[PDB]
């Protein structure tokens, strides 16, 4: 089956360099021009660069010109994007996308996309989260999962036994460069002193597991 | 530079409804316009190329129309998996995409349940205070959350996070978090979260005294 697979994404500090790659299989890669397209968190799609099928003609967006270099190695069925002098605003999921080839007399819409690779441009150090209670016929309670890097964290309640009425918010990047989120759950008022409530927070990147009991 | 702008930015609709969304180019792109569908965190999917051509395997309920500067995408009858963001893209001069039209599940107006949480005694040991205001299970998405500390409206020290539509009841939930130094937190008494929403006949305030 036709498939495009991006690799190389990760945490990279501002001003540094990173070489993404995109490996193709299931079609004649050397016959197709290929694009890089990126999507910043919460934003729309932004075309980044095009290379022709034989690596000859290369086009760039003004936002990346002079810092990013597109290239390809057809013998390895692989496309590259060398990113230099990375800025914070280069933080995005990067996609490779194939020219669709619907017409031979013009470029085409992008028919085949990869799954994307996430590039996070940050100087933040790896840190496991502080977990603070959000203490409480329906009562709300939760856990504040603060100051962790990099993404993600998982939150469960009562070791997965409590899933009804749970809302775990997407992380927000604080001005300190560290992420923060809350997980909340609405429960009966009548059992607030009887029913134990514990949020289980797992920060995979920092080898951190925290269990916080939340009480009135 | 050729820009393409989509209208509307958000479209609320129900399964079986017909939806038509528009895309306008800042100058003529002939017929070099494509439509893509993207679900959150997923790769975009090509729906239509050359303004009206249906990409292979795309269901026939998707149709595209237009030329020059005015183009539209129509879904003849929405299916449950069609809720998504739709992007148009012009490939006449370089490659530029629109800002996206989010096609969202319509439901009845639901006012938020509002909760306020003071900072934990644990966190206050550490030097920072976080005050959390929760808006639970509301619709539509538009909501204004304002913080007041001793009747002073707060600005610049809060951040909001909103969930996606709940898969069962199609509501939103929202957190607003006010960040203060413990010194500033201990300098004041009344902390209030004031919420305005369509489901509320007048703004709702939740507050505590430190």
């Amino acid at each position: 089956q036709v498939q495009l697979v991006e690799s190389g994404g990760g945490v990279v500090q501002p001003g540094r360099s990173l070489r993404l790659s995109c490996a193709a299989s299931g079609f004649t890669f050397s016959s197709y021009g290929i694009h890089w397209v990126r999507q910043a968190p919460g934003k729309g799609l932004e075309w980044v660069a095009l290379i022709w099928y034989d690596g000859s003609n290369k086009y760039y967006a003004d936002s990346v010109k002079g810092r990013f270099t597109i290239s390809r190695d057809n013998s390895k069925n692989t496309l590259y994007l060398q990113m230099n002098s990375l800025r914070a605003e280069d933080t995005a999921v990067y996609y490779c996308a194939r020219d669709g080839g619907h017409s031979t007399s013009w470029s085409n819409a992008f028919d085949i996309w990869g799954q994307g690779t996430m590039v996070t441009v940050s100087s933040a150090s790896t840190k496991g989260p502080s977990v603070f209670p959000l203490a409480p016929g329906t009562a709300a309670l939760g856990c504040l999962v603060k100051d962790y890097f990099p993404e993600p964290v998982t939150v469960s309640w009562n070791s997965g036994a409590l899933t009804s009425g749970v809302h775990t918010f997407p992380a927000v990047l604080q001005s300190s460069g560290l992420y923060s989120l809350s997980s909340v759950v609405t429960v009966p008022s009548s059992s607030l002193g009887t029913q134990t409530y514990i949020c289980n927070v797992n920060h995979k990147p920092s080898n951190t597991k925290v269990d916080k009991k939340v009480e009135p | 530079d050729i820009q393409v702008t989509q209208s509307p930015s958000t479209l609320s609709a129900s399964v079986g409804d017909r939806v038509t969304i528009t895309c306008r180019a800042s100058q003529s792109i002939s017929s070099w316009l494509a439509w893509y569908q993207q679900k959150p965190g997923k790769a975009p999917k090509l729906l239509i190329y050359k303004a009206s051509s249906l990409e292979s395997g795309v269901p026939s309920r998707f149709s595209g129309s237009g030329s020059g500067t005015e183009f539209t995408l129509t879904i003849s009858s929405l299916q449950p998996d069609d809720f998504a963001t739709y992007y148009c893209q012009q490939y006449n001069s370089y490659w530029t995409f629109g800002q996206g039209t989010k096609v969202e599940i319509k439901r009845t107006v639901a006012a938020p349940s509002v909760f306020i949480f003071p900072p934990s005694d644990e966190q206050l040991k550490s030097g920072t205070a976080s005050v959390v205001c929760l808006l639970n299970n509301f619709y539509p998405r538009e909501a204004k959350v304002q913080w007041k500390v001793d009747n002073a409206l707060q600005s610049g020290n809060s951040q909001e996070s909103v969930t996606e539509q709940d898969s069962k009841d199609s509501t939103y939930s929202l957190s607003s978090t006010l960040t203060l130094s413990k010194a500033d937190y201990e300098k004041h008494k009344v902390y209030a979260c004031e919420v305005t929403h369509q489901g509320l006949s007048s703004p709702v305030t939740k507050s505590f005294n430190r």
Binding site: Y32, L50, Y53, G101, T104 | N92
Partner: peptide, 9 residues
Amino acid sequence: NPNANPNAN
């Protein structure tokens, strides 16, 4: 022309 067809023919 950046919009010229990028594929082999």
